[PDB]
């Protein structure tokens, strides 16, 4: 097909358990000495055996991150514009069958929240909507982007997947970043997590980052939703997808997120448990695989864990977040999921200073 779905097809018969069974401690030590890592060297760093070398991995991953990013940490925050959605994502608080107050911000409410967020010093903003081309079509997001570009120098979207021409229209309006999570790369698990709605189309969402990069998107952020499937395999396909995009679009800045499932309206329990050490090994392994790729850490993680991971390869953190439409002015507003780190921008910035890190607000200052 000429997309990343061809790579997924080539790994449909890959025996991950047989590969891990062949991994030894000498394989891990060799890879820690290498300059460049193949996709399977990355898979070897995700292995149970590699847990014996997490200290050595963190030592090297910290050095690689300082080399390409300096002692900086880019800050951003999400802005939910609307929560209308036709999809039935079992893990999400905005799924169609959930009962909540559906709301879409007027243009004046968007500008007011933009002023509230800009008053904290943030220059990077990420906007989100549900999948509802009737209540939040591309034209609506285009009008919001035009207001937001008065306050923020970098606007990223995390919305429903678009055609290449739709992305090109939003890039022309001032969008410079794309965040889209494949959620789960296993097609069988994906079908169970998405029983109804256009999001059930596995290929259309898998190929969204490419259509965006072809339209000229500057940066793309991807990731599997940790908790939905075998985490090592999902982490591997996130790195493989990141590597595929970076080799295909050498001028695009490719980043990943390792978001873990959180409590949410609906109450769906995650299929597998992902521990804090799993999350650390994932981040460390990916930093060694792609040393120049950004690694975003959201407020799904608690403050103490995010403070530990400042020195572990994370390059972008959210602060002062809110997952509800208008929840910054309404404490009873229902969010997409429950956040963990409730710290403001200022509290996160003051913590970073205390660790010897420079909080930055524009992405070109990370060096
Ligand atoms: C905006 C992103 O938030 C993630 N997301 C959706 N539902 C949840 C949840 N219950 N917990 C944590 N993250 C979630 C999805 O991966 C979605 O893409
Ligand atoms: C608000 S969830 C993220 C945006 C969109 N609904 C998606 O799942 O891709
Ligand atoms: S994850 Fe996105 S598409 Fe799925 S129910 Fe939530 S808002 Fe809708």
Indicate left, alpha or beta for 313 from its phi (over 0: left) and psi (-120 to 50: alpha).
Answer: left
Q: Tell me which residue has its CA closest to atom 1 in ligand 3.
A: 92
Distance 185 CA to ligand 1 centre (A): 15
Q: Is the Cβ–Cβ distance between 359 and 348 less than 8 Å?
A: yes
Q: Which residues contact 252 (CB under 8 A, 6 or more apart)?
A: 213, 217, 218, 219, 220, 245, 246
Q: Which atom of ligand 1 is nearest to the CA of 266?
A: 10
Task: List Cβ neighbours of 321 (8 Å cut-off, separation of 6 or more).
Answer: 77, 78, 298, 299, 339, 341
- The residues pairing with 82 across neighbouring beta strands, listed in sequence order, are 104
Burial class (CB in 10 A: 0-12, 13-18, 19+), 25: exposed
Distance CA 329, CA 340 (A): 19
Residue 322 is assigned to a ligand binding site: no
DSSP β-ladder status, 253-256 and 219-222 = parallel
CA separation for the pair 145, 338 (Å, rounded): 26
Angle of helix 25-33 versus helix 54-69 axis, rounded to 10: 20
- Ligand 2 centroid to Cα of residue 78, in Å, is 12
C-alpha–C-alpha distance, residues 241 and 238, integer Å: 5
Q: Which domains, ranges and CATH numbers included, belong to the chain?
A: 5-365 (3.20.20.70)
- Distance of alpha carbon 349 from alpha carbon 359, whole angstroms: 6
Q: At what angle do helices 107-118 and 138-148 cross, to 10 degrees?
A: 40
158 lines ligand 2 (CB under 6 A): yes
Which atom of ligand 3 approaches the CA of 183 most closely? 1
Helices (H), the chain: 5-10, 16-21, 25-33, 39-45, 54-69, 107-118, 138-148, 164-173, 187-193, 202-206, 208-214, 231-248, 276-289, 303-308, 345-354
d(CA 212, CA 224): 18
Which atom of ligand 2 is the closest one to the Cα of 181?
9
Question: Resolution in angstroms for this experimental structure?
Answer: 2.0
- Taking the centre of ligand 1 as the mean of its atom positions, its distance from the CA of residue 34, in whole angstroms, is 35
Q: Is the CB of 130 within 6 Å of ligand 2?
A: yes
* Burial call 164-199: b when 16+ CB within 10 Å, e when fewer: bebbbbbbebbbbbbbbbbbbbbeebbeebbeebeb
Tell me which residues have their CB closer than 6 angstroms to ligand 1. 91-92, 128, 158, 181, 183, 225, 259, 261-262, 264, 300, 336-337
Beta-ladder partners of 318 = 76
| Atom from ligand 3 closest to the CA of residue 197 | 3
Among residues 23, 1, 102, the alpha carbon closest in space to that of 333 is found at 102
**Cβ neighbours of residue 114 under 8 Å, at least 6 residues apart?**
79, 125, 147, 148, 150, 151, 152
Technique of determination: X-ray
Q: Residue 89 annotated as binding?
A: yes
Q: Is 85 annotated as a binding residue?
A: yes
- Please count the residues of the chain: 367
82-103 per-residue burial string, b: 16 or more CB within 10 A, e: under 16: bbbbbbbbbbbbbbbebebebb
Reduced to 3 states (helix: H, G, I; strand: E, B; else coil), residue 78 is strand
Q: Is 268 in the pocket of ligand 3 (CB under 6 A)?
A: no
Q: Which long-range contacts (CB under 8 A, 24 or more apart) does 13-20 make?
A: 16/43, 16/230, 16/232, 16/233, 16/236, 19/43, 20/47, 20/48, 20/49, 20/232
Q: Cα(306)–Cα(201) distance, rounded to whole angstroms?
A: 34
Contacts of 268 (CB under 8 A, 6+ apart): 90, 91
Any atom of ligand 3 within 6 Å of the Cβ of 85: yes
Could you tell me which of 184, 178, 340, 172 has the C-alpha nearest to residue 262?
340
């Amino acid at each position: 097909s000429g997309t990343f779905y061809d790579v997924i097809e080539d790994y449909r018969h890959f025996d991950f358990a047989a590969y891990f069974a062949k991994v030894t401690d000498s394989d891990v030590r060799r890879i820690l000495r290498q300059d460049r890592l193949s996709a399977l060297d990355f898979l070897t760093l995700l292995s149970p055996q590699a847990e014996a070398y997490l200290e050595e991995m963190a030592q090297k991953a910290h050095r690689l991150t300082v080399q390409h990013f300096g002692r900086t940490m880019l800050l951003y925050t999400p802005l939910y514009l609307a929560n209308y959605c036709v999809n039935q994502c079992v893990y999400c608080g905005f799924q169609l069958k959930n009962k909540l107050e559906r709301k879409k911000l007027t243009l004046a409410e968007v500008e007011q929240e933009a002023q509230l967020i800009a008053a904290t010093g943030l220059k990077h903003i990420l906007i989100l909507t549900g999948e509802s081309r009737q209540h939040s079509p591309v034209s609506y997001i285009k009008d919001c982007v035009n207001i937001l570009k008065k306050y923020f120098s970098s606007i990223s979207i995390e919305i429903y997947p678009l055609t290449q021409e739709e992305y090109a229209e939003l890039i022309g309006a001032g969008v410079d970043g794309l965040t889209i999570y494949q959620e789960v790369y296993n097609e069988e698990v994906y079908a169970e997590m998405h029983p109804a709605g256009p999001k059930r189309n596995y290929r259309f969402r898998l190929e969204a980052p490419e259509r965006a990069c072809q339209a000229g998107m500057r940066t793309v952020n991807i990731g599997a939703l940790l908790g939905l499937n075998d985490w090592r395999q999902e982490a591997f396909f996130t790195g493989l997808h990141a590597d595929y995009l970076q080799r295909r679009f050498p001028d695009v800045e490719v980043s990943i997120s390792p978001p873990r499932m959180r409590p949410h309206l609906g109450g769906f329990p995650p299929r597998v448990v992902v521990s804090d050490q799993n999350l650390v090994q994932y981040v460390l392994a990916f930093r060694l695989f792609m040393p120049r790729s950004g690694i975003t850490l959201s407020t799904r993680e608690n403050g103490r864990l995010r403070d530990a991971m400042v020195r572990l390869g994370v390059t972008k953190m959210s602060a002062g977040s809110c997952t509800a439409v208008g929840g910054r002015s309404d404490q009873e507003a229902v969010g997409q999921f429950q956040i963990s780190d409730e710290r403001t921008v200022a509290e996160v910035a003051a913590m970073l200073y205390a660790q010897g890190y420079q909080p930055v607000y524009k992405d070109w200052q990370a060096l």
